[PDB]
Amino acid sequence: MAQAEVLNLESGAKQVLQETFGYQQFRPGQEEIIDTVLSGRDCLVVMPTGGGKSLCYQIPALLLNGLTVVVSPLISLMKDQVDQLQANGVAAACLNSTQTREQQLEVMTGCRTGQIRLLYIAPERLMLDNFLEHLAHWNPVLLAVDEAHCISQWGHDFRPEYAALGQLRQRFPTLPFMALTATADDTTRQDIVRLLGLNDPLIQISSFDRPNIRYMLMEKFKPLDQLMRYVQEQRGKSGIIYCNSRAKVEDTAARLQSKGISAAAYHAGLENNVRADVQEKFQRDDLQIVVATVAINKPNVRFVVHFDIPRNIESYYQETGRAGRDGLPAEAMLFYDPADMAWLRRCLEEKPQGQLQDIERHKLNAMGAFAEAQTCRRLVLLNYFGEGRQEPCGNCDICLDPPKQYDGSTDAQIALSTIGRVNQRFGMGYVVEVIRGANNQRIRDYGHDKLKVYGMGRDKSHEHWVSVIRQLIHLGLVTQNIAQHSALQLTEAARPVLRGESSLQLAVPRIV
Ligand SMILES: Nc1ncnc2c1ncn2[C@@H]1O[C@H](COP(=O)(O)OP(=O)(O)OP(O)(O)=S)[C@@H](O)[C@@H]1O
Ligand SMILES: [Mn+2]
Ligand SMILES: [Mn+2]
Ligand SMILES: [Zn+2]
């Protein structure tokens, strides 16, 4: 009926939480979003991996009168929210181009007459065949954009069909909007807001730390043996192993099977009833292990293995973010080889030059720098999302075996002072040439040869300077700007090192 369930909205949220979704307390972020959403103020909600984002629009939808529309690109999961929501008495529905015309009209007719409270619609469907015009007669009280980084060319998963979502604000000037995402760095967060035309929204950015996940890496070397010994050492704990090919999945699954490990294969070339069996056997812990391509929200996954490295940190974060959703101790292990990053680079550098290849090259490079990190793996991930932190976690493979340290105060001011001195406009190599005092026309053309930093670092190698700055980006003192061609930029945390007010310990850069 689209009828508000409670009389007092304030105490309504937590009423519903407990009485309708059975939970006991709100997860930080959650109340503030929900109260803001009931108030009618636009929002951008950035909740970490499996942090509880759907509740943020489901609870307000249950407490308001009218139709809440939820847009999502994940057809075949949207359907599965519908059914569980219907299970719990919640009057949900979805509407995509994958339905039959008869079935789409029936969902239109329940929105028309207010038998549907919550409507999950694919982006493409929402802008086609004058849907907005019909949507305007159904008392629409709230539009939620899920997966909202998908509208940005700067994120890791731009989808062209979300583009047209920038028309809705204009069409629906009193319609409150919320934009939800679990994966979007600063640029992308900023872009989401601009493109959807969020009106002075509350921007709530939860933390990205999952502290119960330990991040590890293993340098490949007879990797199949390494992958079998790794699994063995898990001593029965549940897991997902990610591979980039259907034959890697299929073959690994068979080898595990052959050693008495209850392991199955998952990928697109399985039949819809077979995937769902796989998923369900995994959900209940009938299977220890699922070997898969990039396609289950199980709360108790103990380990996530990446056999091949992802093309970006965003993907690496969502994929490892599947382990340990119950909050108990879990682990992510990435098997890496520097040749694997030379492949991807080769692959990428003969795709059509331009804007898109750049966005892709910056994101690959930052994935590549995480893998070759000499700094806490958790700090790399948080400072990549803009959650600037300098305290090592103590629960990742670099922190379990720290690299030899040296006082880097002098190295860091040199590097921090060059970046500021060149007006924060230049990428890593140019800066490093200025630090080393190369004989470069470009340098002479900009007069950087005249600077006092020019050549202060000549006695150390290009790789030394590369590591220093990479350690500064990993620690949150320096960002690489993706919208300015990866220009090295200074953050507030640089201030005390840059002033000489505080010392800084860095790893002695590795000889490679
Ligand atoms: N306050 C809460 N207390 C307990 N369980 C909760 C709470 N909020 C949500 N849940 C659960 O948290 C889980 C995931 O929340 P979702 O919204 O489905 O994940 P998400 O944060 O949106 O995930 P990603 O990053 O997109 S994968 C589900 O088990 C629940 O609905
Ligand atoms: Mn409240
Ligand atoms: Mn979600
Ligand atoms: Zn650490």
mmCIF file of N, CA and C in Angstrom, residues 105-157:
data_model
loop_
_atom_site.group_PDB
_atom_site.id
_atom_site.type_symbol
_atom_site.label_atom_id
_atom_site.label_comp_id
_atom_site.label_asym_id
_atom_site.label_seq_id
_atom_site.Cartn_x
_atom_site.Cartn_y
_atom_site.Cartn_z
ATOM 1 N N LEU A 105 4.366 -5.513 -17.058
ATOM 2 C CA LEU A 105 3.144 -4.749 -16.867
ATOM 3 C C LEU A 105 2.474 -4.987 -15.516
ATOM 4 N N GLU A 106 2.604 -6.164 -14.927
ATOM 5 C CA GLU A 106 2.022 -6.596 -13.682
ATOM 6 C C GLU A 106 2.672 -5.969 -12.454
ATOM 7 N N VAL A 107 3.945 -5.707 -12.629
ATOM 8 C CA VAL A 107 4.756 -4.998 -11.678
ATOM 9 C C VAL A 107 4.450 -3.504 -11.848
ATOM 10 N N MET A 108 4.238 -2.997 -13.061
ATOM 11 C CA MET A 108 3.789 -1.630 -13.269
ATOM 12 C C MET A 108 2.436 -1.369 -12.616
ATOM 13 N N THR A 109 1.490 -2.291 -12.812
ATOM 14 C CA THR A 109 0.195 -2.284 -12.173
ATOM 15 C C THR A 109 0.187 -2.406 -10.661
ATOM 16 N N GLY A 110 1.180 -2.897 -9.980
ATOM 17 C CA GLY A 110 1.240 -2.956 -8.525
ATOM 18 C C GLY A 110 1.908 -1.682 -7.966
ATOM 19 N N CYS A 111 2.631 -0.986 -8.852
ATOM 20 C CA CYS A 111 3.243 0.280 -8.487
ATOM 21 C C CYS A 111 2.160 1.347 -8.673
ATOM 22 N N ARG A 112 1.454 1.360 -9.789
ATOM 23 C CA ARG A 112 0.290 2.189 -10.024
ATOM 24 C C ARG A 112 -0.673 2.168 -8.835
ATOM 25 N N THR A 113 -1.160 1.006 -8.448
ATOM 26 C CA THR A 113 -2.145 0.870 -7.412
ATOM 27 C C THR A 113 -1.584 0.802 -6.003
ATOM 28 N N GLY A 114 -0.295 0.995 -5.773
ATOM 29 C CA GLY A 114 0.314 0.961 -4.478
ATOM 30 C C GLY A 114 0.297 -0.341 -3.727
ATOM 31 N N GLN A 115 0.220 -1.464 -4.441
ATOM 32 C CA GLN A 115 0.493 -2.742 -3.790
ATOM 33 C C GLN A 115 1.992 -3.002 -3.735
ATOM 34 N N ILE A 116 2.860 -2.203 -4.368
ATOM 35 C CA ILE A 116 4.291 -2.495 -4.274
ATOM 36 C C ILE A 116 4.951 -1.311 -3.573
ATOM 37 N N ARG A 117 5.727 -1.656 -2.570
ATOM 38 C CA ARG A 117 6.401 -0.639 -1.751
ATOM 39 C C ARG A 117 7.804 -0.358 -2.267
ATOM 40 N N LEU A 118 8.408 -1.491 -2.670
ATOM 41 C CA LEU A 118 9.809 -1.383 -3.057
ATOM 42 C C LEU A 118 10.142 -2.025 -4.375
ATOM 43 N N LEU A 119 10.639 -1.248 -5.325
ATOM 44 C CA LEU A 119 10.765 -1.588 -6.717
ATOM 45 C C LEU A 119 12.234 -1.471 -7.144
ATOM 46 N N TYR A 120 12.830 -2.616 -7.402
ATOM 47 C CA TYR A 120 14.172 -2.761 -7.911
ATOM 48 C C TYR A 120 14.128 -2.762 -9.447
ATOM 49 N N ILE A 121 14.757 -1.789 -10.092
ATOM 50 C CA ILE A 121 14.694 -1.680 -11.543
ATOM 51 C C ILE A 121 16.089 -1.532 -12.153
ATOM 52 N N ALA A 122 16.306 -2.197 -13.276
ATOM 53 C CA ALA A 122 17.565 -2.030 -14.003
ATOM 54 C C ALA A 122 17.657 -0.640 -14.603
ATOM 55 N N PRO A 123 18.838 -0.031 -14.682
ATOM 56 C CA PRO A 123 19.008 1.318 -15.221
ATOM 57 C C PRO A 123 18.421 1.570 -16.599
ATOM 58 N N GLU A 124 18.788 0.732 -17.565
ATOM 59 C CA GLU A 124 18.240 0.655 -18.906
ATOM 60 C C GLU A 124 16.719 0.676 -18.870
ATOM 61 N N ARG A 125 16.060 -0.084 -18.027
ATOM 62 C CA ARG A 125 14.608 -0.151 -17.996
ATOM 63 C C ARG A 125 13.954 1.152 -17.561
ATOM 64 N N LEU A 126 14.589 1.791 -16.579
ATOM 65 C CA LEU A 126 14.142 3.031 -15.979
ATOM 66 C C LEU A 126 14.147 4.199 -16.956
ATOM 67 N N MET A 127 14.974 4.233 -17.987
ATOM 68 C CA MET A 127 14.966 5.351 -18.922
ATOM 69 C C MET A 127 14.265 5.039 -20.236
ATOM 70 N N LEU A 128 13.812 3.802 -20.431
ATOM 71 C CA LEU A 128 13.151 3.415 -21.665
ATOM 72 C C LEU A 128 11.630 3.354 -21.652
ATOM 73 N N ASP A 129 11.042 3.586 -22.822
ATOM 74 C CA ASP A 129 9.612 3.538 -23.054
ATOM 75 C C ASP A 129 8.795 4.395 -22.101
ATOM 76 N N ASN A 130 9.183 5.655 -21.966
ATOM 77 C CA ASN A 130 8.536 6.598 -21.067
ATOM 78 C C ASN A 130 8.233 6.010 -19.697
ATOM 79 N N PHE A 131 9.255 5.401 -19.088
ATOM 80 C CA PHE A 131 9.026 4.839 -17.760
ATOM 81 C C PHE A 131 8.846 5.954 -16.753
ATOM 82 N N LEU A 132 9.642 7.021 -16.830
ATOM 83 C CA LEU A 132 9.618 8.134 -15.905
ATOM 84 C C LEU A 132 8.264 8.832 -15.802
ATOM 85 N N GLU A 133 7.577 8.868 -16.950
ATOM 86 C CA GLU A 133 6.260 9.442 -17.038
ATOM 87 C C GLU A 133 5.234 8.644 -16.246
ATOM 88 N N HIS A 134 5.360 7.321 -16.303
ATOM 89 C CA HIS A 134 4.489 6.449 -15.526
ATOM 90 C C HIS A 134 4.899 6.466 -14.047
ATOM 91 N N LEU A 135 6.236 6.538 -13.875
ATOM 92 C CA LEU A 135 6.805 6.561 -12.539
ATOM 93 C C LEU A 135 6.334 7.805 -11.792
ATOM 94 N N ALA A 136 6.021 8.882 -12.495
ATOM 95 C CA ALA A 136 5.547 10.120 -11.953
ATOM 96 C C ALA A 136 4.119 10.048 -11.424
ATOM 97 N N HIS A 137 3.332 9.073 -11.858
ATOM 98 C CA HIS A 137 2.007 8.944 -11.253
ATOM 99 C C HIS A 137 1.953 8.009 -10.066
ATOM 100 N N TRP A 138 3.006 7.305 -9.681
ATOM 101 C CA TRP A 138 2.940 6.304 -8.623
ATOM 102 C C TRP A 138 3.412 6.717 -7.242
ATOM 103 N N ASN A 139 3.370 7.988 -6.885
ATOM 104 C CA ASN A 139 3.782 8.470 -5.568
ATOM 105 C C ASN A 139 5.204 8.140 -5.145
ATOM 106 N N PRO A 140 6.204 8.448 -5.953
ATOM 107 C CA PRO A 140 7.571 8.027 -5.699
ATOM 108 C C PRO A 140 8.177 8.933 -4.647
ATOM 109 N N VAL A 141 8.525 8.286 -3.547
ATOM 110 C CA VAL A 141 8.967 9.025 -2.363
ATOM 111 C C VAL A 141 10.480 8.993 -2.250
ATOM 112 N N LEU A 142 11.183 8.106 -2.946
ATOM 113 C CA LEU A 142 12.611 7.941 -2.742
ATOM 114 C C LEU A 142 13.250 7.114 -3.852
ATOM 115 N N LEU A 143 14.350 7.644 -4.392
ATOM 116 C CA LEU A 143 15.150 6.966 -5.384
ATOM 117 C C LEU A 143 16.548 6.664 -4.812
ATOM 118 N N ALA A 144 16.876 5.382 -4.724
ATOM 119 C CA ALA A 144 18.142 4.901 -4.221
ATOM 120 C C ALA A 144 19.089 4.441 -5.323
ATOM 121 N N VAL A 145 20.290 5.028 -5.462
ATOM 122 C CA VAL A 145 21.129 4.431 -6.524
ATOM 123 C C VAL A 145 22.151 3.454 -5.967
ATOM 124 N N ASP A 146 21.967 2.158 -6.239
ATOM 125 C CA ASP A 146 22.908 1.180 -5.729
ATOM 126 C C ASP A 146 24.088 1.103 -6.696
ATOM 127 N N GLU A 147 25.182 0.500 -6.242
ATOM 128 C CA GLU A 147 26.359 0.428 -7.117
ATOM 129 C C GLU A 147 26.628 1.772 -7.795
ATOM 130 N N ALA A 148 26.691 2.891 -7.082
ATOM 131 C CA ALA A 148 26.601 4.174 -7.730
ATOM 132 C C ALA A 148 27.914 4.656 -8.328
ATOM 133 N N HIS A 149 28.999 3.939 -8.059
ATOM 134 C CA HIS A 149 30.257 4.299 -8.717
ATOM 135 C C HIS A 149 30.146 3.945 -10.200
ATOM 136 N N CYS A 150 29.273 3.020 -10.601
ATOM 137 C CA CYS A 150 29.055 2.678 -11.987
ATOM 138 C C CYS A 150 28.756 3.845 -12.938
ATOM 139 N N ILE A 151 28.397 5.044 -12.501
ATOM 140 C CA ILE A 151 28.151 6.194 -13.338
ATOM 141 C C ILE A 151 29.431 6.953 -13.652
ATOM 142 N N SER A 152 30.537 6.622 -12.978
ATOM 143 C CA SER A 152 31.729 7.442 -13.141
ATOM 144 C C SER A 152 32.719 6.779 -14.087
ATOM 145 N N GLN A 153 33.192 7.549 -15.053
ATOM 146 C CA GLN A 153 34.308 7.115 -15.873
ATOM 147 C C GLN A 153 35.527 6.933 -14.966
ATOM 148 N N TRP A 154 35.724 7.650 -13.865
ATOM 149 C CA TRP A 154 36.826 7.410 -12.968
ATOM 150 C C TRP A 154 36.736 6.187 -12.080
ATOM 151 N N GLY A 155 35.631 5.462 -11.966
ATOM 152 C CA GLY A 155 35.663 4.274 -11.106
ATOM 153 C C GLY A 155 36.245 3.086 -11.890
ATOM 154 N N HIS A 156 36.058 1.916 -11.266
ATOM 155 C CA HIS A 156 36.589 0.696 -11.856
ATOM 156 C C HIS A 156 35.479 -0.039 -12.595
ATOM 157 N N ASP A 157 34.275 0.540 -12.725
ATOM 158 C CA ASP A 157 33.250 -0.265 -13.398
ATOM 159 C C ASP A 157 32.138 0.538 -14.054
#
